[PDB]
Design a protein around this nucleic acid. Structure first.
Lengths: 90, 49, 62, 246, 72, 107
RNA sequence: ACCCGAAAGAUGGUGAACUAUGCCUGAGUAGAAUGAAGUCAGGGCCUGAUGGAGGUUCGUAGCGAUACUGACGUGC
RNA sequence: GUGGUAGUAGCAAAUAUUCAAAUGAGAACUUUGAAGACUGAAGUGGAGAAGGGUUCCAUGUGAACAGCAAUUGGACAUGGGUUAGCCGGUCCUAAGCGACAGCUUAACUGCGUAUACAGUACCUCGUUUCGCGAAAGGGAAUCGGGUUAAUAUUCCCGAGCCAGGACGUGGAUACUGUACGGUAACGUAAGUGAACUCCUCGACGCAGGCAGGUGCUCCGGGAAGCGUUGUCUUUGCUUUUUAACAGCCACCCUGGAAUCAGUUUAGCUGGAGAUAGGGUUAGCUGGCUGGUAGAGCACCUUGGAAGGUGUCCGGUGCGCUCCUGACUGCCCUUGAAAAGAGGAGGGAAAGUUGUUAUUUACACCCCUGGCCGUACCAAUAACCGCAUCAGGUCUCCAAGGUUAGUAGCCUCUGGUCGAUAGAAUAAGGUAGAUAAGGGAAGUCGGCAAAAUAGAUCCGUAACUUCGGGAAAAGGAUUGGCUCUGAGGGCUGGAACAGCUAACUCAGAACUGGAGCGGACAAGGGGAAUCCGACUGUUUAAUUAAAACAAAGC
């Protein structure tokens, strides 16, 4: 069975805090409790040890990342642009 | 109890000052002394030492 | 003597029970017994060479 | 009379910072010969949650140049930085994420974090989670350099000052709401005791300039001069402008 | 504390000159018996089950060694 | 029925004052202060526990013979062994690649 | 300045064993109710288990003190 | 200093005493017996801390004190009592705090991480400054039985261990240079390692269930003694114990996985090598022997303290307790340091077949272990509240029955009957019960008290932030006795044959003054309005709210 209609992971927080605030939490709480793919081994076993720290369970390696996802999109843009700036300098 | 040796001796001394005066002392000449003035009961009045 | 009677099942009426069914015997325990019983069965059948590798794993998950 | 809890905060005592289980002041490696005539290979050994901040600290293991021993600095970790990675500090290191170049070597448009105001400053600017300072443009020589700060403002800085290439980790940790008072409490326990703040209007007219009155109002302008003394300066200090922005 | 398991070692530990006494214990079940040499660090002890071997063994102990003690 | 009293000076429920109910030749039930459970040597940089070498509190590591405190290998006392293979396969190859260049640098 | 009488002022010291708050290091808190994500099966997203989240609820010890405007009010 | 008030108010919480004999001038009150009660293991029990300071123990007693009494006493008097290498302090560092260099100030004070702080003679190294700060943090090593009027892990008997320092006899190893074995994981009676460096232990959160273990509780057989006996009862109860210390019982190899397989209660694991087969290693508070029956315990017979037998063999569990282990989850919370012990990398030194030289934890043997605390109370009488005050004050252990239950109710071990008594039973009180008919008409106001209450099965609205409301509302059943069905484990190879262990559900028959959650325990409900969103906080001793805080803005 699916055992709630909508609220999902945030049935936890019950009948309080207000539904707009509760939804903001739902979408990024869904991110952080996810497993992500490891860069280094491949296996999708990465968990968030602490805000800004992620550990690949199978691999044993730890790496830095976002608060609530492995790769923040701003940081993905910098990895693109610094690879470009290195190439044109030669 | 878990006292230091200093505090043991201060306690020790004030046992030895808590006894009735000798009987023979009053008998001696020119003495107005009657029963010891400084006697203390361990409940009634306290040391802090 | 009271217990001898209890084995008989007496004094086990609805009136006697003053605790919720879950409190008296948890479903978590009744789950565990069963699931340990059935897993045991399959391992001794597989080591006997009645049940196959492939049939074992299907029965396990059901 | 009576001193306001604004004024009591400088006195020290009970408003000091809770430093005890914090794991060392985070810094860049102190300006060597090796860093300014070439480069020095670090190795990232650990990544650590320092309490009372959003950023991770990388713990980095350099070889000493002069003695046999092995040194250990703790930086603020740029994100995309892993346990086993070589960092390369110094002048003639590549422009890649991790590495600590001087600003004059970085070609403009580069994102930088943990930047030194002066030369050999050890690293003051853009250290908080998610932030960066972007390079705008150089001098003709390469002596001085423009930077754009996380505020907005534009800062002239010496080119022989340095910083880490890339964004500081723990990015975007304000987009959640703390739902509970409890989650605010656990935040400010491992920093100073700044919480919970009482509204000055609730107080009596002893304790605060706003407080008092049979209705709960402020009663003079909330806006106050720069020139006002200790214990006048409450509410909106030296304010150019008030009300909702646009 | 310690045991001995064979007759090679038990003859050495008796002859060793700091061995004080040999208390000897006997108990009915059948007649299983213990020798115990109180030496200096440890009390060594040697279980024998047969009585007729143990009677022979008491002769093999030296006379210049001091004590013997028995229950009964 | 029978209930017991702490024997040592510490009458609190800390780590150090961990205790173990025994019964005696008296038929009398009584504590013994067994200490804290010793962590066995997790050793780097893997941080796996080492085979061969027992959990003791670290002063009693004195009592043991030298044999017992190690493994007879290279880096045996403090290494994973598996980790050790890494050390050799590095230091073999990183010498060989460094050597192959320095013969090619004669030209 | 006939005798007795203030509310106060100032100078220099003594206190956080009670209480207010921060820090360091220790200790403590039955048994029930409700059943969030995750997972497994069967059916065409539903149904059944599994699971054990919460500044959740009932309620011991412990912390507290609403009502009777009860007793007591030259009191224990 | 002394009256009237006045022999008056009053001595009424914590269920409770009674009978006999002894002692004494004198007994409602002391002691001993016999009965009867209470406390009811989150005890009024057994031990510590703070605080107290001789109250501890014995013998004695004329007052006063112990709100009646007193032959009694925490009172009074005269004596006696506290034994440590291992129990603590001592040592380390935490938050912090004193001082050095200096810097301020008339000083008093205030600040204080600044500085020139090993191989007679010859070199070569050299960055941190001294100290205080935990009798719950860290940390060298101890356990059994006995013993005194009062002390015990401290005395005695026995069995060990640790720190420092070491002779000796007998073994290992090397003597052109520090042991061997195994494919490996690693191993064995031993198996050198300076400077310098790196690492490990010390060293760490909370919640959740799961598995295993100690102790407790429990059921049955055997052997002792005991109890009951008008009646029945192969019966009911007590004892049947084993210390520290010491020895022994995740990872590697072969191999190569999809028709994916292994696996937990839960998920996870696997070509960065799974299942399987064979190894290695970790361990607990596991098993066996030593310690160890000589002790302890339970009984029996001769003395007027001597000598004996017995101490055996098995189960059970979502049980209660503390501990370990590996897991799972939670955090804008990620959960001390230092002393000290050890490992490794390094290869400095020595050693030429004998008085050598490495072994001072290879085995055995030998010597020494200072200083201070140590009695007792720890509270309805040893502390603080002026007091032997219905108040307050940190920690540990924690039995049986009923039950979900450390709830309430009754009980065993341990403890207690300490709280002035006797007689009468008016009004008025204090607490506690019950009331025909009516049912808020009382009152500012349903204030007070009633009524509801457990479990099972059925059923459940408006509204809603879809999570809730909800135990909504509204109903039916429950005892005893006699049965029936369903649910496991271990043995020999279509599933059969033997042996056997749980308290848990479902249903039926019969029976009763229609009772049965029979005592205890245990929501009254519903419809609306105002304020605050919620949990949280507050005027110690008249105000807990609508006030403060709160997340969000």
């Amino acid at each position: 069975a699916k055992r709630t209609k909508k609220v999902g992971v945030v049935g936890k927080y019950g009948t309080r805090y207000g539904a707009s605030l509760r939804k903001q939490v739902k979408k990024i709480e869904l991110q952080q409790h996810a497993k992500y793919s490891c860069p280094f081994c491949g296996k999708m076993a990465t968990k968030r040890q602490a805000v800004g720290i992620w550990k690949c369970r199978g691999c044993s390696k730890v790496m830095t990342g976002g608060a609530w996802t492995l790769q923040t999109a701003a940081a993905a843009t910098v990895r693109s642009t610094v690879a470009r700036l290195r190439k044109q300098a030669g | 109890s878990i006292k230091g040796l200093s505090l043991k001796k201060h306690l020790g001394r004030k046992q030895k000052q808590n006894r009735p005066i000798p009987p023979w002392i009053r008998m001696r000449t020119g003495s107005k002394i009657r029963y010891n003035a400084k006697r203390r009961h361990w409940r009634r009045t306290k040391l802090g030492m | 003597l009271y217990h001898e009677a209890k084995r008989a099942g007496r004094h086990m009426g609805k009136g006697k029970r003053k605790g919720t069914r879950e409190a008296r015997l948890p479903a978590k325990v009744l789950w565990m017994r069963r699931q340990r019983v059935l897993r045991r069965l399959l391992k001794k059948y597989r080591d006997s060479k009645k049940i196959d590798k492939h049939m074992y794993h299907s029965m396990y998950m059901r | 009379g009576r001193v306001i809890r604004a004024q009591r905060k400088g006195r020290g005592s009970v408003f000091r910072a809770h430093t005890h289980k914090r794991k060392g002041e985070a810094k860049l490696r102190p300006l060597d010969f090796a860093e300014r005539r070439g480069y020095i290979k670090g190795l990232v050994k650990d990544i650590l949650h320092d309490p009372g901040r959003g950023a991770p600290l990388a713990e980095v293991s350099f070889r000493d140049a002069y003695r046999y021993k092995l040194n250990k600095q703790r930086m603020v970790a740029v994100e995309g930085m892993y346990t086993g990675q070589f960092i390369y500090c110094g002048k003639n290191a590549a422009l890649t994420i991790g590495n600590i170049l001087p600003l004059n070597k970085m070609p403009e448009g580069t994102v930088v974090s943990n930047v030194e105001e002066k030369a050999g400053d050890r690293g003051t600017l853009a250290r908080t989670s998610g932030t960066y300072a972007t390079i705008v443009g150089h001098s003709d020589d390469g002596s001085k350099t423009r930077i754009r700060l996380p505020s907005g403002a534009r800062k002239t800085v010496s080119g022989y000052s340095r910083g880490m290439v890339g964004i500081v980790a723990g990015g975007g940790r304000i987009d959640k709401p703390m739902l509970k008072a409890g989650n605010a409490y656990h935040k400010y326990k491992v920093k100073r005791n700044c919480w919970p703040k009482v509204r000055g209007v609730a107080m009596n007219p002893v304790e605060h300039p706003h407080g008092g009155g049979n209705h709960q109002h402020i009663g003079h302008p909330s806006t106050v001069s720069r020139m006002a003394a200790p214990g006048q300066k409450v509410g909106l200090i030296a304010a150019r402008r008030t009300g909702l922005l646009r | 504390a310690k045991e001995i398991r064979d007759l090679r070692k038990f003859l050495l530990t008796a002859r060793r000159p700091d061995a004080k006494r040999v208390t000897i214990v006997r108990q009915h079940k059948s007649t299983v018996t213990k020798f115990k040499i109180r030496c200096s660090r440890y009390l060594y002890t040697f279980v024998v089950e047969d009585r007729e071997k143990a009677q022979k063994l008491e002769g093999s102990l030296p006379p210049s060694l001091e004590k013997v003690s028995i229950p009964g | 029925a029978p209930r017991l009293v702490y024997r040592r000076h510490n009458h609190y429920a800390t780590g150090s004052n961990r205790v173990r109910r025994v019964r005696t030749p008296g038929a009398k039930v009584v504590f013994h202060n067994v200490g804290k459970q010793p962590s066995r040597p997790k050793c780097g940089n893997c941080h796996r526990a080492l085979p061969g070498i027992p959990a003791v509190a670290p002063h009693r590591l004195r009592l043991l013979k030298k044999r017992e405190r190690t493994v007879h290998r290279a880096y045996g006392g403090s290494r994973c062994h598996a980790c050790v293979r890494e050390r050799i396969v590095r230091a073999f190859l990183v010498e060989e690649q460094k050597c192959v260049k320095q013969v090619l640098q004669v030209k």
